From a paper:
[name] is a periplasmic flagellar protein that chaperones P-ring formation. P-ring formation is a key step enabling the bacterial flagellum to pass through the outer membrane. [name] can be divided into three domains, denominated as D1 (residues 1–74), D2 (residues 75–142), and D3 (residues 143–198).
Atomic models were built from amino acid residues Q1 through L198 (numbering corresponds to the mature protein) for the open and closed forms and refined at resolutions of 1.95 Å and 2.3 Å, respectively. The conformation of [name] is different in the two forms. In the closed form, D3 is closer to D1 and forms a compact structure. This occurs largely because of a bend of about 70° around the Cα atom of R136. The disulfide bond forces [name] to stay in the closed form and constrains the movement of domain D3. A rivet structure, which lacks the LP-ring of the hook basal-body, was isolated from the wild-type strain expressing FlgAR113C-S190C.
Residue numbers in the entry: 1 to 198
Amino acid sequence: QDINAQLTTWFSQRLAGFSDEVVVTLRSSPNLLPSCEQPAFSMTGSAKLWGNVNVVARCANEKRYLQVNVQATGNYVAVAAPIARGGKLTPANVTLKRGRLDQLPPRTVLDIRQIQDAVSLRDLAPGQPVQLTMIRQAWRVKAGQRVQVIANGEGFSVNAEGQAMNNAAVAQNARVRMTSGQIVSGTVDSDGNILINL
């Protein structure tokens, strides 16, 4: 049962800020588990946060692939009052509701800061989870603008300047041409700054 406890803790920590209740269950055979007592878990795979995922369990040069099931409960953005097509999304129209993140439809908005100055693409009814496929977010960053790039690491932080190379909404990927001429890539935050996680 200790392996589930490790995964539950590893995922709870990874899902900090998103979920307040995480439960993880191993699907692959425990015989295929690596020799170490505490394997190092790495998500060197696609960007899927929860559900049924593949976790790399490293055991000092010994590599293993574990199939796991991640259940997550937290906040997401839901429609609170009917929104007309072309209608703006506001705090009076949408609200945060608590539910199972793993059960939500794809590309569901979790943070209210994402839908600043956003318009509906279709008719929306109360209770419906806000999906990115059903809205048009305003650009937080515009191509050609100078932006601040903030890179954080373990005991290591970098602040630098560049020019945005593409239009991007809050929480979307932004490519930035640094003064040195180099291209970097990060996530647009609410403040319009570019965050790079190293």
